[PDB]
Design a protein around this ligand. Structure first.
Ligand code: MG
Ligand code: MG
Ligand code: MG
Ligand code: MG
Ligand code: MG
Ligand code: MG
Ligand code: MG
Ligand code: MG
Ligand code: MG
Ligand code: MG
Ligand code: MG
Ligand code: MG
Ligand code: MG
Ligand code: MG
Ligand code: MG
Ligand code: MG
Ligand code: MG
Ligand code: MG
Ligand code: MG
Ligand code: MG
Ligand code: MG
Ligand code: MG
Ligand code: MG
Ligand code: MG
Ligand code: MG
Ligand code: MG
Ligand code: MG
Ligand code: MG
Ligand code: MG
Ligand code: MG
Ligand code: MG
Ligand code: MG
Ligand code: MG
Lengths: 227, 394, 46, 122
RNA sequence: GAGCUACCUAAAAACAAUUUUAUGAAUCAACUCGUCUAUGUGGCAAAAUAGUGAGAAGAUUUUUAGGUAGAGGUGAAAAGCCU
RNA sequence: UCUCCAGGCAUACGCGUAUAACAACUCGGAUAACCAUUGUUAGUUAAUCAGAAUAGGCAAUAAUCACACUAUAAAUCACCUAUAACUUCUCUGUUAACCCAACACCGGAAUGCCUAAAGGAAAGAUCCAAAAAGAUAAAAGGAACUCGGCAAACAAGAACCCCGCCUGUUUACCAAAAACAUCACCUCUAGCAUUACAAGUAUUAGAGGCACUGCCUGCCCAGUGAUCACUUGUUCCUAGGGACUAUGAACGGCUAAACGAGGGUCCAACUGU
């Protein structure tokens, strides 16, 4: 009888009502522990393909205007409503975004290095080595999946041929095609890790239930005696 | 690119057809003759069913492209719920109008005259505020969807009592929930406005022109400001099935051909459902300009030209506590180009009738800090309200 | 606390948990009905 | 603790539970939560004029009851159809195609009163 | 078999007065719980009564409907709870 | 009429005629009277109380008297474009001292209004024994009682040890605690999308441990001549010849307070212990 709430097909900026799980599945059994209750939250559909040219428009660099930088219940980072043409869409906001700012979204792969302005989306080929990036996408056109948490920045270590090495926030090095799109700068809420929950009740507000109260090398035969 | 809508929630894919259908020359045996499903027979394929007559309760609409009024060119419609992202600046560009702060000097001078002052004006306005917010209902704290219409209706009645001094005021009448609509072009964009007014006040004589011909001509130097990268049509409804229409709120022959004031109410109980002051002003301008343009077309036909006799219309918008006053002069019907003679709008914004109202006394440690009444009543706001009503009579 | 009052009547719960439509929804439930028919029960379900 | 043997009726259960007592519907509930009674759906009693009618509820005990002979298709056919066909056969003006001439109905569709499926109440 | 109980989902509800650095703060009702004592021990009760006590804007309490089922479920682990 | 007591009236859920009158006096109420019992007849009345056309486009802006404010846990069809239809009141709930507890059970039972204007009766009659239960009063004394100031008191104040950081949670029905959880801190696992984790992405998530705070201890990280030379180390080729090196583990003593129906102890007062 469990139907997922993720049943909306059309992108909108209207907040969407979310149903909580509690850690259960469609079967109805707990699959993950520590999830329950919390404050009621609304989902704001984020757009992780920064370079999405508007409908009935050419695939060339375009600009968008930042309406407001909001607080997101569903994320550690903060989101920004950005407007361009006749379209509004939520996006992830970088460290220094402000209302009224203008951000570029470019398809052009610069033969030479492109000056890096935080918040603008360029193909990794355009960027020069060493520039901090966020909201990287593993495959061209896939959509951002990495470095989209609060304060996380990835360095662009190297570019050779049509491939670049991206150092993920965990220091795990990844490689992608330079056609892949990344957003310059680190993600907002750079001080998210400095927060102090302070009391147990605050965690219960965040939908986190308390942990359970419950409290292996095998020697080889030569070593079994000497264990 | 992430796709919205998880597959588990989508309509399930049709089950594959029975393999007997694949075999050519073979007629499958199905449960059609039984008139009920059985698990062990082939599933029939039924032809589309036609009732053979039209059932109104189960009417089915045709697709968009088959509608008679389907048109290739999109028409951007502005309606009540549209909230322009750029506010007035976008509304000024769409209507080809120039903005002047403050109300017209003629309107302002009307209420400076002591004779216009109503007897016990301040007390009656305060009583209206108290009645609108507290006394009218049996409940402890009335909701905005009730008092917001009430406060404006009471004010108009208070202003309408001036017929004792001025018999001319009998030549104007009011209607409610009246539809206004126009269609005009702006730089290759087809724009339409569909709207209503909470109350419409109309007169039997045109309002005096506010700006002289020289002032109207001088506007040619002024240039409409642009808001790149945002398009002029953002937050408008792109409609492909539409009928071109012009509406002034009444049919031809209405004895009061000239509309005097339009009243707009932000009476929603919840804040997110209420237009902001900036966006309310944009809505007032577009709805007022539409009323002016519809009247212009009726008098002078469908031609595009600079009007020899400009049209004046007034608009008032409130959420029950804040009032916005707008005066529009329509100077031209040649709006396709963005250069030339421009319309003129006078706006006085964010006029507080009262800062706050205490429906119940504020008591701290058995001490009445705040009495149960309007807080920081401003009579200046009503004087502007009275001035606009009296304009064109005194 | 005092026990014995575990029945908290609710007709919606009763018909949904033990009703005709509930019993016919699964083959195991249909077999429940068949057993009660063979015994001769006057009440096949709630 | 519930009663399993008593009938399920609208008096029982919560307010949300409702069901009919067997009365035929006389109208439709449209959108906006409005009942719209249909004049045609309301049964109309066809009552004859009883002036001058000689039949009363009871019969004389001296009135002889007849031999019971329930009506059959053959009995109806002989009384109504047989004389016409027999007369026409002697004149020779009979053919299979024109059975409708004697009262046959090829189909019940288009009749106000259809014998099968029956479309009128008693 | 989850109309009890354990946990969860959806929709709802309740919280006076008094102080306060403004809150899983204080005093104390309604409400929730069940510290200690006496009574009761086939009792009013297959766990209650009478006092005395703990919390009482919160990790609070409570209502309606739904969910997870025994090789299992749930568990701020008492191997506690699942008529 | 009098004496006294102080949860009543509605709705929801549930119950199903226990409702009302008459007649009965077998059974039922733990006894009578009278009926809650038996038989017969009746009853609950609603357009307002309650239950029961289609296809498109589209949304940044809580609530709290919503103003000023502050905040964080981030918080509820409409409107528009077209299409279609172009006058309607039937159906169902409605009684009651009632439901879940085997009972006419000192129990359990949601919301709104109100706190006596509503609703009720602790004593069948008599007697004044013992033992037992409950309430009040106490000469002198004031913990001498007792395992223990348990219980009671005209008292309801002070202080210190042990344990746990704190508010919370737990063995429905013998344990409420020092146990569990808890913020904080630490370890381990994971580089990723259309049903949980999550419409999330290493400042994230999961698994688990553990009081935090500040303060100590210091496993450890080739040597010797100094970024530098030789001996080592590791590999090979055969004891020779090449090749190559390139802060912090484990722990502790305690923030040091605050708080506790926790476990001990003391003083004052208070008392029939
Ligand atoms: Mg543990
Ligand atoms: Mg039982
Ligand atoms: Mg319950
Ligand atoms: Mg349940
Ligand atoms: Mg309170
Ligand atoms: Mg507290
Ligand atoms: Mg207390
Ligand atoms: Mg306390
Ligand atoms: Mg629990
Ligand atoms: Mg244990
Ligand atoms: Mg054990
Ligand atoms: Mg009698
Ligand atoms: Mg008896
Ligand atoms: Mg009675
Ligand atoms: Mg009786
Ligand atoms: Mg009644
Ligand atoms: Mg019992
Ligand atoms: Mg009384
Ligand atoms: Mg006695
Ligand atoms: Mg005493
Ligand atoms: Mg004494
Ligand atoms: Mg002693
Ligand atoms: Mg002794
Ligand atoms: Mg004591
Ligand atoms: Mg503790
Ligand atoms: Mg505690
Ligand atoms: Mg308990
Ligand atoms: Mg116990
Ligand atoms: Mg305790
Ligand atoms: Mg206990
Ligand atoms: Mg512990
Ligand atoms: Mg304790
Ligand atoms: Mg002493």
């Amino acid at each position: 009888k469990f139907v997922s709430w993720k049943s909306r097909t059309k992108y909108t900026v209207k907040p969407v009502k979310m149903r909580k799980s509690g850690g259960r599945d469609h079967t109805g059994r707990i699959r993950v522990h520590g999830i329950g209750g919390g404050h009621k939250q609304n989902y704001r559909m984020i757009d992780f393909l920064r370079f999405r040219p508007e409908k009935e428009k050419a695939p060339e660099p375009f600009e968008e205007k930042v309406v407001v930088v909001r607080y997101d219940p569903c994320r550690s980072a903060d989101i920004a409503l950005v407007a361009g043409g006749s379209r509004k869409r939520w996006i992830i906001a970088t460290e220094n975004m402000k209302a009224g700012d203008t951000i570029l979204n470019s398809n052009h792969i610069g033969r030479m290095a492109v000056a890096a302005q935080e918040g603008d989306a360029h193909p990794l080929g355009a960027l020069p080595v060493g520039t901090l990036i966020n909201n990287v996408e593993s495959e061209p056109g896939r959509g951002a999946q990495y470095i989209r948490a609060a304060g996380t920045c990835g360095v662009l270590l190297r570019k050779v041929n049509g491939t670049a090495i991206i150092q993920l926030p965990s220091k795990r090095q990844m490689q992608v095609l330079e056609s892949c799109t990344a957003t310059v700068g680190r993600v907002s809420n750079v001080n998210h890790n400095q927060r102090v929950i302070g009391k147990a009740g605050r965690n219960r507000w965040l939908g986190k239930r308390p942990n359970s109260g419950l409290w292996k090398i095998r020697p080889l035969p030569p070593m079994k005696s000497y264990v | 690119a992430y796709e919205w809508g998880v597959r588990s929630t989508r309509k399930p894919e049709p089950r594959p057809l029975d393999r007997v259908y694949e075999i050519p020359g073979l007629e499958p045996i199905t449960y059609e003759g039984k008139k009920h499903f059985v698990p062990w027979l082939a599933r029939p394929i039924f032809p589309p069913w036609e009732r053979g007559w039209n059932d109104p309760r189960f009417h089915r609409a045709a697709p968009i492209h088959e509608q008679t009024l389907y048109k290739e060119e999109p028409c951007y419609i502005f309606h009540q719920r549209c909230r322009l992202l750029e506010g007035m600046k976008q509304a000024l560009w769409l209507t080809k109008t120039k903005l002047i702060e403050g109300l017209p000097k003629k309107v302002l001078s009307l209420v400076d005259d002591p004779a216009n002052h109503i007897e016990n004006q301040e007390q009656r306005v305060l009583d209206i505020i108290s009645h609108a917010r507290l006394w009218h209902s049996t409940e402890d704290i009335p909701k905005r969807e009730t008092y917001c219409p009430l406060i404006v209706d009471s004010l108009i009645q208070l202003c309408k009592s001036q017929i004792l001094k001025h018999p001319s005021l009998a030549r104007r009448t009011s209607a409610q929930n009246c539809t206004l609509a126009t269609t005009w072009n702006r730089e290759s964009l087809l724009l339409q406005v569909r709207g209503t007014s909470s109350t419409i006040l109309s007169a039997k004589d045109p309002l005096p022109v506010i700006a002289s011909r020289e002032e109207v001509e001088a506007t040619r130097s002024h240039v409409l400001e642009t808001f790149y990268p945002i398009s002029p049509t953002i937050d408008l409804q792109e409609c492909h099935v539409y009928e071109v229409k012009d509406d002034t709120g009444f049919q031809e022959g209405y004895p009061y051909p000239h509309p005097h004031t339009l009243y707009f109410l932000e009476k929603a109980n919840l804040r997110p459902q209420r237009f902001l002051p900036e966006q309310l002003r944009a809505k007032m301008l577009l709805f007022a300009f539409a009323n002016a343009l519809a009247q212009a077309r009726l008098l002078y036909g469908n031609t595009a030209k600079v009007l020899e006799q400009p049209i004046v219309v007034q608009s008032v918008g409130t959420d029950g506590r804040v009032f916005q006053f707008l005066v529009l002069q329509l100077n031209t019907t040649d709006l396709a180009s963005s250069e030339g003679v421009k319309n003129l709008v006078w706006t006085d914004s964010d006029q507080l009738l009262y800062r706050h109202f205490w429906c119940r006394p504020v008591i701290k440690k058995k001490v009445v800090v705040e009495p149960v009444g309007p807080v920081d009543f401003q009579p200046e706001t009503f004087r502007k309200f009275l001035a606009l009503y009296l304009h064109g009579v005194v | 606390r005092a026990r014995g009052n575990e029945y908290q009547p609710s007709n919606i719960k009763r018909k949904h948990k033990h009703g005709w439509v509930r019993r016919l929804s699964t083959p195991a439930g249909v077999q429940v009905i068949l057993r009660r028919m063979l015994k001769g029960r006057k009440s096949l379900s709630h | 603790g519930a009663d399993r043997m008593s009938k399920w009726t609208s008096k029982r259960g919560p307010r949300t539970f409702t069901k009919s007592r067997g009365a035929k519907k006389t109208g439709i509930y449209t959108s906006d939560r409005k009942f719209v009674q249909i004049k045609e759906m309301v049964p109309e009693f066809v009552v004859p004029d009883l002036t001058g009618f000689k039949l009363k509820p009871y019969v004389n005990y001296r009135a002889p009851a007849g031999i019971d002979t329930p009506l059959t298709a053959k009995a109806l056919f002989q009384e109504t159809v047989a004389p016409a066909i027999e007369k026409d056969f002697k004149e020779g003006t009979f053919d299979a195609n024109n059975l409708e001439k004697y009262g046959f109905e090829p189909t019940q569709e288009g009749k106000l009163f259809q014998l099968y499926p029956k479309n009128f109440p008693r």
